[PDB]
Amino acid sequence: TRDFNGTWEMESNENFEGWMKALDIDFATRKIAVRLTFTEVIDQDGDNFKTKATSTFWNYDVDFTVGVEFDEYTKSLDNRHVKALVTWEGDVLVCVQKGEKENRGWKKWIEGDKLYLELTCGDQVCRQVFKKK
Ligand SMILES: *C/C=C(\C)c1ccc(-c2ccc(N(C)C)cc2)s1
């Protein structure tokens, strides 16, 4: 399936700490963030995605069109300029963010009724799993 529409509730989060540290997120922010449950709301219409991550203390929204490069400034994360591109590899949605950090980006897919997210930066991978609400 290629349909990521829905409200998705975090049920599993692995190495969130390592990933944030690879992005040079400040220690105090990491200390709180690694504790928190996140919810991801995805609105998808063909290539057009609008996504919104929420937690008690932090939000992170990003909209994109699959196949269309977009310059990104990651304000509420690590405050860097990257060139971002989201494309399909089969049923896996793949984002590459070209910039200072190598191997930076993510992958999303569905297996069964669950959303899987792999976040990458440098040699660090964070893996998250969400259940559909
Ligand atoms: C497709 C999934 C994306 C773009 C994201 C999932 C989680 C994100 C995130 C986690 C933590 C923070 N802070 C600043 C604590 C920001 C964003 S993005």
Swiss-Prot record:
Keywords of this entry: Cytoplasm, Retinol-binding, Transport, Vitamin A
Tissue-specific expression: Higher expression in adult small intestine and to a much lesser extent in fetal kidney.
Pfam families (UniProt xref): Lipocalin
Gene Ontology MF terms in the entry: fatty acid binding; molecular carrier activity; retinal binding; retinoid binding; retinol binding
Amino acids binding all-trans-retinol: E40, K108
Keyword Kinase in record: no
InterPro entries named among the record's database cross-references: Calycin (IPR012674), Fatty_acid-bd (IPR000463), ILBP (IPR031259), Lipocln_cytosolic_FA-bd_dom (IPR000566)
One of the protein's GO biological processes: vitamin A metabolic process
Gene Ontology CC annotations of this record: cytosol; nucleus
Location relative to the cell: Cytoplasm
SUPFAM superfamilies: Lipocalins
Highest taxon of source: Eukaryota
Domain comment as written in the entry: Forms a beta-barrel structure that accommodates hydrophobic ligands in its interior.
Family, as annotated: Belongs to the calycin superfamily. Fatty-acid binding protein (FABP) family.
Purpose: Intracellular transport of retinol.
PANTHER family noted in UniProt: FATTY ACID BINDING PROTEIN (PTHR11955)
Record-given protein name: Retinol-binding protein 2
Organism, scientific name: Homo sapiens (Human)
Organism taxonomic ancestry: Eukaryota, Metazoa, Chordata, Craniata, Vertebrata
